[PDB]
Amino acid sequence: RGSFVEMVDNLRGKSGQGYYVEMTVGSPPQTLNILVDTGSSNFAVGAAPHPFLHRYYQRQLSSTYRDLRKGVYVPYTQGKWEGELGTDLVSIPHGPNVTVRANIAAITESDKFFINGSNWEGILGLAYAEIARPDDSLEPFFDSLVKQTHVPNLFSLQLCGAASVGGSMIIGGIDHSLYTGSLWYTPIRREWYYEVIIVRVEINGQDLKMDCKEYNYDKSIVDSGTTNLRLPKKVFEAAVKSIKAASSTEKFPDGFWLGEQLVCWQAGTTPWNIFPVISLYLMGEVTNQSFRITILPQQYLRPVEDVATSQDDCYKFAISQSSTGTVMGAVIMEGFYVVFDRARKRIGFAVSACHVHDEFRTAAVEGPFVTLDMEDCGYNI
Numbered sequence: 001r002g003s004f005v006e007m008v009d010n011l012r013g014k015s016g017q018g019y020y021v022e023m024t025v026g027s028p029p030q031t032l033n034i035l036v037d038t039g040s041s042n043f044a045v046g047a048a049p050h051p052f053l054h055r056y057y058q059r060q061l062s063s064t065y066r067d068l069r070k071g072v073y074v075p076y077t078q079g080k081w082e083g084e085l086g087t088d089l090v091s092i093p094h095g096p097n098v099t100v101r102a103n104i105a106a107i108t109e110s111d112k113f114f115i116n117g118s119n120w121e122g123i124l125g126l127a128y129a130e131i132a133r134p135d136d137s138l139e140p141f142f143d144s145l146v147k148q149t150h151v152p153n154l155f156s157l158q159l160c161g162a163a164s165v166g167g168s169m170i171i172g173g174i175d176h177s178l179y180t181g182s183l184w185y186t187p188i189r190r191e192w193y194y195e196v197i198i199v200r201v202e203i204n205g206q207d208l209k210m211d212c213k214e215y216n217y218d219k220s221i222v223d224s225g226t227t228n229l230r231l232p233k234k235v236f237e238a239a240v241k242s243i244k245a246a247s248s249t250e251k252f253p254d255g256f257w258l259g260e261q262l263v264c265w266q267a268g269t270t271p272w273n274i275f276p277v278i279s280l281y282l283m284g285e286v287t288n289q290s291f292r293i294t295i296l297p298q299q300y301l302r303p304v305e306d307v308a309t310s311q312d313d314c315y316k317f318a319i320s321q322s323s324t325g326t327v328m329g330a331v332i333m334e335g336f337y338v339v340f341d342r343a344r345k346r347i348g349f350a351v352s353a354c355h356v357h358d359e360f361r362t363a364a365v366e367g368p369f370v371t372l373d374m375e376d377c378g379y380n381i
């Protein structure tokens with residue numbers, strides 16, 4: 001259709017707390033704010049009165065609730081949640097005009113999961129069944145939505161940064177007002193995470209000249225549920241070394257680059273221009289063809305507004321090292337309109353109409369480029 005006016009601006013959030021959509025669960029409808037997460041595959045909601053929660057799923061109030069009589073325990077690298085599986089009727093007030101019977105994990109115990117001060121009480125896992133918990137028989141929400149309705153097998157995300165954030169989750173299509181120029185598509189390598197292949201990395205146009213397999217060790221994913229651009233250790237080391245050299249006009253402590261401390265400047269006097277652009281070349285749709293996406297310091301140097309001990313403008317270096325491969329989190333996604341074209345196993349990138357930039361530099365999506373041996377960039381076990 002190309003125009004989904006009802007769904008524009010259906011995302012809200014706060015800096016560092018993520019992007020949530022309004023959803024309803026059960027009959028009569030119970031309203032919940034739900035984190036949009038392309039890096040997981042469970043629809044999981046608070047169902048107990050945790051003190052951090054504004055709202056929670058009260059199963060006893062729902063006539064359409066069905067118990068699946070099975071639990072689920074989900075440990076993460078930091079915290080944890082545990083829940084009871086069921087199904088109920090789910091809709092998205094500012095989404096398609098439909099109602100779906102979806103799997104819902106009713107969260108009954110958690111640790112370091114809900115954020116104190118956040119305005120969301122659940123997670124919408126938008127990735128594929130392969131990574132669903134406890135196993136791939138638990139149908140993810142979007143799979144149910146496509147199966148039960150005529151909603152096309154596609155969604156797109158415009159995450160708008162820079163303190164309230166906003167944006168759009170267009171379910172079933174693309175809204176052309178949300179981007180400028182053309183969309184460029186990269187293949188979904190495998191349907192588990194939204195896995196992609198990075199084929200080349202530039203800092204201010206200067207190639208890292210690394211074995212491209214390192215860029216995707218052990219994978220590269222697109223994840224709206226991650227803040228940072230997360231890079232594998234060796235790639236992070238090379239990237240930081242290059243960013244240091246590009247920004248050597250000013251010197252910063254080692255801890256800043258490791259995200260161990262913040263750096264603060266006098267109000268409205270951030271030297272963005274001293275900081276380099278970051279370009280990721282992604283595998284294209286065609287043999288030997290790639291395209292380039294480019295982000296600015298506006299994306300990777302992120303303001304920290306909850307600093308009581310300082311009066312200045314303080315920033316977090318939001319590129320970090322990873323043991324689980326590249327993660328293209330909000331640092332990447334805030335620059336772009338991202339199309340998760342499930343029907344065609346591809347992810348589209350275009351310059352976001354809402355991305356934060358200055359008058360000298362702009363986030364960019366450019367192609368085509370000639371890149372050989374792009375298949376060798378993918379990692380195999």
Ligand SMILES: CCS(=O)(=O)[C@]1(C)CC[C@@](CF)(c2cc(NC(=O)c3cc4c(cn3)OC(F)(F)O4)ccc2F)N=C1N
Nearest residue numbers: 015016017018019037039040076113223224225226227330
């Ligand atoms: C493999 C991906 S993962 O499964 O390990 C994981 C990174 C952690 C676990 C989970 C749920 F599965 C998860 C994510 C979050 N997000 C955020 O809080 C959050 C905060 C943000 C953001 C994006 N997001 O952009 C921002 F605006 F800058 O601020 C919170 C609790 C969770 F429990 N989702 C992922 N994508």
